[PDB]
């Protein structure tokens, strides 16, 4: 009963960031060595835990959230950050305990004519709470006049596509991101490293 991390990391397609995917991992033995012993990752930052200790630790549940963003947006997947992604698409808590892992996926998610399957939320009335997911497509009301589901002056569609192309600067290229959350509740631990 090993935890299925390869399903998350090696999935053929990833979610739009506004509709980020979440895999809930319970009741299993987790071998994180396949992660921290790999050299394919361009971002690997853990908060509240060192990755080299993960095989010796136990948690109530583990969460793996996955999505695609721009490379120059990966810095927003961190506690306390702001920006379009952190404010409107995927927000981490200040007291986050977990890892943020990102790799360049230009070879997979870019198209010469643009990949318009990947979207992000551009307009929102307020910032997202931590771990909140909003997939609504209501017309954004920029003013005080109700929009009645119609685009116009101060009435804007809230989603926008990345349109990923094989650009020359890596900061514009698409990056796949997995965020691992390690949950500790007042309950028996169900996800444990092989050493425990």
């Amino acid at each position, epitope marked *: 009963n090993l935890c299925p991390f390869g399903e998350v990391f090696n999935a053929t397609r990833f979610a739009s960031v506004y509709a980020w995917n979440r895999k809930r991992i319970s009741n299993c033995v987790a071998d994180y060595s396949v992660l921290y012993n790999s050299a394919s990752f361009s971002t690997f930052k853990c908060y509240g835990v060192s990755p080299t200790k993960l095989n010796d630790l136990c948690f109530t549940n583990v969460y793996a959230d996955s999505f695609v963003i721009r490379g*120059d947006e990966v*810095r927003q997947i*961190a506690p306390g*950050q702001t920006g379009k992604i952190a404010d409107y698409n995927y927000k981490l808590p200040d007291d986050f305990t977990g890892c943020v892992i990102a790799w360049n996926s230009n070879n997979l998610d870019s198209k010469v004519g643009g990949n318009y399957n990947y979207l992000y939320r551009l307009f929102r009335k307020s910032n997202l709470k931590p771990f909140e997911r909003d997939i609504s497509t209501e017309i954004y009301q920029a003013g005080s006049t109700p929009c009645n589901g119609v685009e116009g002056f101060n009435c804007y569609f809230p989603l926008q596509s990345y349109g990923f192309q094989p650009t020359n600067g890596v900061g514009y290229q698409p990056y796949r991101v997995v965020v691992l959350s390690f949950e500790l509740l007042h309950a028996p631990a169900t996800v444990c490293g092989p050493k425990k």
Partner: antibody, heavy 129, light 108 residues
Framework: QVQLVQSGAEVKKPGASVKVSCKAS????????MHWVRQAPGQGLEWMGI????????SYAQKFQGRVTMTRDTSTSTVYMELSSLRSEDTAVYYC??????????????????????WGQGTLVTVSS | DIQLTQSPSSLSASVGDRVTITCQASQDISNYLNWYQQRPGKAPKLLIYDASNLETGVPSRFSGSGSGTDFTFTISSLQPEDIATYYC?????????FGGGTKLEIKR
């Protein structure tokens, strides 16, 4: 929505002490370190020290050791900087500044991230009779 | 302590030009060097962290480079609201220290 709001400008006599407050809102107070940085009028920036908002441990710059005390009250999400034996050189704008959290990289090494993304509005402290 | 020498102390340039100021450290500080912009009477605002990374929300016209002892900060298209004093700051080793500053003015 992070807000750092500092106490008002004050005048203090030489040899006395001043306590500047910094009230934090919009984030989990105990998750971040808080630093203090001062600026004498028309001069540059000077780092004073750092306090752990969780446990209240502190570390001060040498030139302020023995003279500065940094405290925190988690109930009110407030950080305090107290400077004693005030001289004319202590006349300055005092700032609380907040950097992001530290993190561990893939190799297990602790990485610090002490760039100040948030600042209070500053507190002018004038040392004069 | 680690001393940060900024250059030039002040300078002026017209709108649209490229500006490159420098910060030199007494010892090796790796890439743990940040650049702040202080508009008159306000708190310093972070523009560049770890000597090359653009802070979120900062216009793309700002950039920085360096590792070791010598660092540079560059504005590509000078803009009216760039009037400020710019400071470098290291955190490779306590105590944290700032540079002397560089006051940028605009010719018109």
């Amino acid at each position: 929505q992070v807000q750092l709001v500092q106490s008002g400008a004050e005048v203090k006599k030489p040899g006395a002490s001043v306590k500047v407050s910094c009230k934090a809102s919009g984030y989990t107070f105990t998750s971040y370190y808080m630093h203090w940085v001062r600026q004498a009028p028309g001069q540059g920036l000077e780092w004073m020290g750092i306090i752990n908002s969780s446990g209240g441990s502190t570390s001060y710059a040498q030139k302020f050791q023995g003279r500065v005390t940094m405290t925190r009250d988690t109930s009110t999400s407030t950080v305090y900087m107290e400077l004693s034996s005030l001289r004319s050189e202590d006349t300055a704008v005092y700032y609380c500044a907040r950097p992001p959290r530290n993190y561990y990289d893939r190799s297990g090494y602790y990485q610090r991230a002490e760039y100040f993304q948030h600042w209070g509005q500053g507190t002018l402290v004038t040392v004069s009779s | 302590d680690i001393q940060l020498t900024q250059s030039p102390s002040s300078l002026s340039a017209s709108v649209g030009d490229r500006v490159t100021i420098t910060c030199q450290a007494s010892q090796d500080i790796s890439n743990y060097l940040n650049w702040y912009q202080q508009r008159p009477g306000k708190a310093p605002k972070l523009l560049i962290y770890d000597a090359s990374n653009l802070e979120t929300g900062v216009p793309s016209r700002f950039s920085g480079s360096g590792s070791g002892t010598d660092f540079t900060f560059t504005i590509s298209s000078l803009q009216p609201e760039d009037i400020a004093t710019y400071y470098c700051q290291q955190y490779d080793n306590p105590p944290l220290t700032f540079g002397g500053g560089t006051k940028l003015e605009i010719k018109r």
